[PDB]
């Protein structure tokens, strides 16, 4: 297990932090959050969606075909 003070080397980097009792826990939750969700959805929709759309079409066709095959045809 590693420990702080032995992780890596860093130089010339300043970090400004504010106390949690000094700031909001939900700053602009909807006024800023909803735009960010839409940005992230657009960036990944084309990678995630087409596979499951392909599943949905194969699912419905296979179920429709299985239903029709079980119904008899006139001789």
């Amino acid at each position: 297990g590693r420990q702080f003070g032995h992780l890596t080397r860093v130089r010339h980097v300043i970090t400004y932090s504010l106390s949690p009792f000094e700031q909001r826990a939900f700053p602009h939750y909807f006024s800023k959050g909803i735009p960010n969700v839409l940005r992230r959805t657009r960036a990944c929709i084309l990678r995630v969606a087409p596979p499951f759309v392909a599943f949905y079409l194969v699912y419905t066709w296979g179920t429709q075909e299985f239903e029709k095959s079980k119904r008899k045809n006139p001789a």
Partner: peptide
């Protein structure tokens, strides 16, 4: 007064 923190990391 503001409860806050400033960290100038300089390992050199």
């Amino acid at each position: 007064f503001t409860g806050s923190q400033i960290c100038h990391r300089e390992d050199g």
